[model samples]
Target: DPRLLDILSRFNREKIPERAVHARGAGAYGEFEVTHDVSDICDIDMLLGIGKKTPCAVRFSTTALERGSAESVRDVKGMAIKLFTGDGEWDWVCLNIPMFFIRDPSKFPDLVHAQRPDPATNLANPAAWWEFVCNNHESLHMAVFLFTDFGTMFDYRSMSGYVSHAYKWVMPDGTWKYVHWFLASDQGPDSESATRDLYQSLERGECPSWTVKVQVIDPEDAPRLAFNILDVSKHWNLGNYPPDIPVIPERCVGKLTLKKGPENYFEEIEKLAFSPSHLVHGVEPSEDPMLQARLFAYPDAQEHRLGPQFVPLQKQSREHAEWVSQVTSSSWSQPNETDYKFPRELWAALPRLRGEEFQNRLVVNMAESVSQIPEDLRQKVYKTLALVAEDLASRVESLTEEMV
Candidate 1:
């Protein structure tokens, strides 16, 4: 009689809360090696010498869905890396794309809520998404990329990871520089859906790797730049960024290779907590508002999901990631025409990356989603896209016309 009651109680408590976002993901154990010297850029012990290997954990995730949802869908992906370095454990919580949808941190909850299914029907609502974007023009740049082939990933092993925030890499002498960090996949981009594709490879002893690179920025140049450098929606080299402040190419700093998968998905992968606030000595957070807001939101969510059980294997020091950046310190309101310039340039660069085929695919994907919205909302979408680039508006318009 006691055994039966205990068995029922254990079964009832088995389910724990999943992550609010990045609900479905795969994680692995790995080592990060400093292949090249970054001492001049940052004074972290992990980057002191070449060939220094540090234990690490990486989590790749599909955003905006439940744990049971299929991996192959049009959505954002997260790449969260935790490095157990000599100084402290550093976590690089990143996205697949370098840029994000909004500039202000306050709008984050609204953005995620709109992306989820409607409350009334629990279904994807094009109207809901358009309503959010139409009111928030800053999101147009990110929306442009998401509505294209870029939204759906075929393989996790080959996709690059990007840091939306312009994180600061500080020198020992009190000097610092803003950096746009990126992880270029050595395996190149893939195809059995991203989840099964990665899991199978690791199961067979195929180690996936990425080349770490960084585009540096002079703190002095921030005030002169055409666009706010702290703006996550405006990616580097986009708009009037480069020519305004000379182009500085990315330099190789390290390599990340995932060599082992979790023995138990629930214990190893699900329990891992990676937060942007978990940083080490040389690297530090910047004035990126979205980054600042997320510093708190992530840990808060982990605590709520995992309860008192949630925290890194290593203990953490808590603080703010919100203030003191040259560009965003003033907190400017009402985006200008200059803000639209970034999306226009990104749209123009599509042909450069994948040629006309990329834009063609993008137009088709855009039309498919736009078809579901009402005519009035559809027109508003067209007007905004045209404000960015003429061809973007025309292509989507032509296809959506045929679609309806």
Candidate 2:
């Protein structure tokens, strides 16, 4: 495991450092509330919203693609929410779709690599992405999420949000749990114009919005499942993960449909950033190395892409003289040679961490993302397949029985 740590320590410096994507986005001032008390699962304060309000900044974006492309381009949408809890900030760096293209963070760079401009054409190529997935094999599950309607969201409001990544859910008693999250809309997805439909619609008074939802799984049960939970590409019945991989896998089969649209495109739709590094207390990211790397890499890049003063940047800007504010702390500033610890680190880093019921419901609802694996990686993949789940090896073996 330390070997993986060594690699991460280096990748942490890969950008020397700069945020990879979601660098360009829009933000707005808003408040979040808890329809119910999840304090039993997490001690975070914002969820106490039963009638309370927590300050927030929401950023929506496109991943593995440039910002200037038509908003309707078939790409993963990014939604990063920051909740200013009483203790600190909690961020939820989410994707437009519930499932991802691959599960292994190991393939993270590769996913981006293939999506970026090709050396010969300077353009994104489906073949490259497909070739890599076919070789890897673990990508099957996520491929179902991608390559489908999930690939295209109408816009931020018309698009729902998901904390698609796996995470450790620490209970109030210090007990641990596992959860994957999904958010649904009361309305449904935005229309597919494949053009500036979202922008044009928003101007016409079609203000889109999404309601938050979650699903969770117990940590002990995570291993017993046939699918690998840690693998980003792997999936179980939507009942196992969150956003139901678009619907509660077995219970229901539907996709995230957005309802709301933005009011102002440039001011609220652009100039925002979302990174996995953002998090809050009581919620912990899994040992998945890719998530680990992003915790440090993303914000660093956001700062570079935007500016050193990125955090202080606001959606509705008002001129204010450059001034510094200081607060007293019980402890002196020190670097751990590692980033901030979870709950605390996530509190300071991310925007929001969803609750257990929401998390549990989401995981069980997802479709297994195991199909993306390529023909060649069967054996190499099994080497660390446990990262997905203990039984994932057999499930994948069963799924590909004839192929093997």
Candidate 3:
């Protein structure tokens, strides 16, 4: 009777505060093998030698919802990766989407507030969401992408993952380059849902994989860009750019293959913690304010969620957080016209690239959320979408009219 009571008491108290964002997710154990030569770029030993394999773990999650929320909700997906190298664990806390909505870390709290469900009704409020987006011009870029098919992924296996913030990759000689990272899915496109694919594949012994690539930019050339390099809201022109400034022009540097599922979902996956600050030698966090803020926030969240003494299974050393770099900036805030170009370009090509069929689906998706807002706020949302792209605005308007 005492043992049974003890078990019951522990069960009730075992639950921790779910992640404020990215509460629902799936995770797997894997290994990453270096496939290309990048010795000159980053001095990380794991990435320096070709064919070297490092143990890794990955977590795919849905943002802006609780753990029990539906998996297929229209929201940004998180791809937090941990590469347990000989030196230490390198945590790339990234997302499925290439770019984020805001660059300033101060506004991040407001951004989450707008995205979360309203307190009064315990329901998502489109009016509050659109009001914030319309006032923040930088958000138009991500808004266009989120409202499109890119936002709703078929599954974690099918979607590509991106490091939205720029990072510094240092050479042994202290030379370094600003770089962005991405994980390109090796699997063919899937129409099935993510939850089903993730479960069925594990059950059937079919492991999924991704090709890891990085886009490198010389530090000297960072100032010459039209937009700020540290700004997460804007993106690089990987298309038609010089070789050095190209968007991951080099072949994949590594491959990540998920080979094992966690035995205890709560212990292995749910309680697992990842922090952008948890880094090894030869890789350093850039001066991106948002990234800097995250370096602190992630670990703080972990200490609160998983006990302060919770030691991760990954490797660690004193050198993991020892390196320091001086970053100078004239102004973190600058005006740039090029920031709008890529988002609008993607919007224009949606019909041509995905066909008329998918474009209509986007309009329908937009209306589903937009139609719920009051007419006054709904009109502003449509107007903001129109500013991103005229056709996008028009399509949403027509669909909203039909739905209302």
Candidate 4:
């Protein structure tokens, strides 16, 4: 009883600090249900079957902003969720967009710097963004994605969430597979690119939610692919490597649902701690250079916000998980019954673009990047894109000039 006074005083003085990113955010608690039987791929108790529910918390935020910023800003939205599975806490650090502006984590800090306000004027600087991308040639792909309609999403409900990293699903037999997590829109965004209606629904006792899906990739095809299997920046073109079709070894497992909203904003939303290090027993992160950097950076930022003593051996019993629906039949791991696309033809056509054609494709893709890109960096992008596809550069240039 007496210790409460000391705790209150300590919290009062250090209540606020500049956030690493995702500073402007909101949260809610909900349930997760497993819809599939992936016992072969993982030992996670929650993913073992069709009726398990795990309790969880999710934080939705905007990238590159202080917590006090306006709710509607044209920036990448954050969708970091934590599932209290039977074994332990599983947190997925994600963004509203699928891919990011850069593949190398070394450029991560600099990318954030460009997105942030300038030091000299203390104002948001588009010039800094141009300067950074202009110097960083590889940023062409993400740079385009950022300026497009996808970058300025309507809000959390209408938009989607992506892990933005490649993860591996390890089997009990010691074999592993690559996978990505995605969450589709719970509701479409209105014309205004804003949804104050979600607040109105909340006030009316109606909570909105999203359904989760996971895309699996086979390990054997890693070496045979035209491009590096581990490249996070370059997505596996659905036209080229459709998971369900071109990749026969790949599997489309299940879906996850978010049913409840958080009741206490301060405790669950403001004090929430999420990181890429929060992996379950069955899932493992790949050796992607950027993912490796996140292993360090993700937790470091959480500690800055939540303190280091966060969840040393956190575990929720079966009843707690079921009551909360952290990983039940409709949460993180989807049911085996659902059906989705696994592009067939595109996946098969990838092998033909090898050697000279691959080089040519990249050169072509660079053309699409040239206009948005500065002249100095345009050559670098062209060469890099050429390595992937010989026709890519020219095609990109022609399409971009048309502004389509």
- Highest lDDT model number: 1
What are the per-residue Cα lDDT tens digits for candidate 2 across 41-158?
A: 5555555446666666666666665545455666677777766777777777787665566543445777788777677978655556656654654454454335344455456566
Q: Which 10-residue window of candidate 4 scores lowest in summed lDDT?
A: 335-344
Q: How many pairs in model 2 have backbone atoms within 3 A of each other, for residues 3 or more apart or on separate chains, i.e. clashes?
A: 95
Candidate 1 structure lDDT: 0.79
**Any idea what lDDT model 2 has?**
0.51
lDDT of 3 by residue, 1-404 (tens): 99999999978787778887888888888899988887766777888788899998888988887887886767888888998888888888878877788866778888899988897999768877888887777787788679777776557888778888888777655567788888888894422267667878878989888888888876666665556677788666656322233453544688889888888989898988888888887778777888888988987887777864431123223442221121233334332454556567766667676798887887788788888878888878877677667877887898888887
Q: Can you write out model 4's per-residue Cα lDDT over 1-404, one digit (the tens) per residue?
A: 77999999887775656478877776666677666666666655667777777777777777887767766666788788788876688887777765667655667788888888778887866556657755655565565445444454467677777786778776666667667767666676432223254545556776565666666666654555554445565565544344443432333334444555667766767777777888778777776777888888867786766774431223335653343243123332221111112111221343464445543444334343355645445555445444334555445655545642
**TM-scores of the candidates in the order shown:** 0.90, 0.59, 0.87, 0.69
Better of 2 and 4 by lDDT: 4
Query: In model 1, which regions exceed 4 Å deviation?
Result: 190-192, 238-245, 309-331
TM-score of candidate 4 relative to the true fold = 0.69
In order, candidate lDDTs are: 0.79, 0.51, 0.76, 0.60
For candidate 2, the per-residue lDDT at 113 reads 84
Q: Using alpha carbons, what is the TM-score of model 2?
A: 0.59
Q: How many backbone clashes does candidate 1 have?
A: 0
User: Runs in model 2 with CA error above 4 Å?
Assistant: 1-19, 190-207, 239-273, 306-404
